[PDB]
Amino acid sequence: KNPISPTIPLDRDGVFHGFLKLPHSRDDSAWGSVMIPLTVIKNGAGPTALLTGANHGDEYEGPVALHELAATTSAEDVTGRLIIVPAFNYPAFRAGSRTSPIDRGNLNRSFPGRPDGTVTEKIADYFQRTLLPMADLAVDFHSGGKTLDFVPFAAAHILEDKATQAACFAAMKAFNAPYSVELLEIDSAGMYDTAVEEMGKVLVTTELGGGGSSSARSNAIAKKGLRNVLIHAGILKGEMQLDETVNLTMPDDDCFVFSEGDGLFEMMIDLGAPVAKGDLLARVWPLDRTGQPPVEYRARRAGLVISRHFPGLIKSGDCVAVVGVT
């Protein structure tokens, strides 16, 4: 029995604004709670979509779209059910950080979680055992965060069940981000991705920009894809917006480049720009001194720069850049 209990019904017709109340006894509140905001919109019979933003706290395109959806959608617009959680790892979202300030918990590495663990593990357990079985479709928004920046794209995994792999790709096509990706997310343990997919459910995941900020273009991409995906699922009516998309893959480790030293980061080729094998991706300047040649990082695969280290300061082990193919 997970101690979380909603403040609103999850199975009644109408529009509900309430919270997932997670008890949390702590120094600044002895009988306190984490009040995870959520909106349930239900109307008649139909599929149920579980919509999450801010799985990592410092990623904002999702929470912006889900807040708008929770505030501008009437029950009559829906055939089915929307479960809307704009801030998924809510303590991290309130702290403005990828991980939670309470337990340093990475929510996207905490599944299946446990009902008696950390605050983050209790969140993961509740979606693992209570919310996901209620859902047919799961849209889990992601962006680069303060340390990464991505080309705006929706992704689907090469997974072993080809039936629900096909369903995931169909929803990615419906999302219609400017780029479309099959992510090399090996290192697959503990993710919400893996929880949804292993249940045979439909998963939509994204990487919409980054840097700890969202733009009007990037907010719009999140709003379009969300609307398309809900129409594609049968929950919302209307005409889908179909624009051009570029298909990209990550077949290899050599799509990735990590830095081996700290310094001042100079990106030499912008996001989304084409790159050939061996082209100079970035150079890192010394923090300590002047007049020394920069440390050069070169592409090991041709394609497009789909991700880059965001901050001006880079550390050893940070991912300099990622190349997407075609």
Provide the minimum distance between the beta carbon of 226 and ligand DAB in the complex, in angstroms, as a whole number.
Answer: 18
Whether 66 and 53 have beta carbons less than 8 Å apart is answered as yes
Q: Does 40 sit near ligand DAB (CB under 6 A)? A: no
CB closer to ligand DAB out of 56 and 173: 56
Strand 137-140 to 48-52 pairing: parallel
- 207 annotated to bind ligand: yes
Considering beta carbons, is residue 39 or 206 the nearer one to ligand DAB?
206
**Opening angle at CA 124, ends 179 and 309, nearest 5:** 40
CB nearer to ligand DAB: give 101 or 190.
190
Q: Which residues contact 288 (CB under 8 A, 6 or more apart)?
A: none
Which among 178, 228, 175, 184 is positioned nearest to 205, based on CA atoms? 175
Least separation in angstroms between residue 144's CB and Zn ion is 7
Handedness of CA 325, 228, 193, 21 (dihedral sign): positive
- Out of ligand DAB, Zn ion, none, what residue 304 binds, judged by CB under 5 to 8 A for its kind, is none
The site partner of 146 among Zn ion, ligand DAB, none (C-beta below 5 to 8 Å per kind) is: none
Task: Mention every residue, 6+ apart, whose C-beta is less than 8 A from residue 316.
Answer: 259, 260, 261, 262
Is 142 known as a binding-site position? Answer: yes
User: Contact at 8 Å (CB) between 150 and 209?
Assistant: yes
Residue 56 in the binding site for Zn ion (CB under 5 A) = yes
- In the three-class reduction of DSSP (H, G, I as helix; E, B as strand; rest coil), residue 99 is classed as coil
Nearer Cβ to Zn ion, position 99 or 128?
99
| Footprint on residues 54-113 left by ligand DAB (CB under 6 A) | 56, 108
| CA-based nearest residue to 274, from 223, 232, 312, 326 | 326
Helix (H, G, I), strand (E, B) or coil at 297: strand
Binding mask 118-157 for Zn ion (x = CB under 5 A): ------------------------x---------------
Q: Which two tokens stand for residue 163?
A: 């039936």
183 lines the binding site for ligand DAB (CB under 6 A)? yes
The tokens for 36 are 């995870």
User: Which listed residue (138, 148, 208, 233) binds ligand DAB by CB under 6 A?
Assistant: 148
In the region spanning residues 117 to 146, those forming contacts with ligand DAB, defined by CB under 6 A, are: 142
- Contacting positions for Zn ion (CB under 5 A): 56, 142
Which residues carry a binding-site annotation for Zn(2+)?
56, 59, 142, 207
- Contacting positions for ligand DAB (CB under 6 A): 56, 108, 142, 148, 183, 185
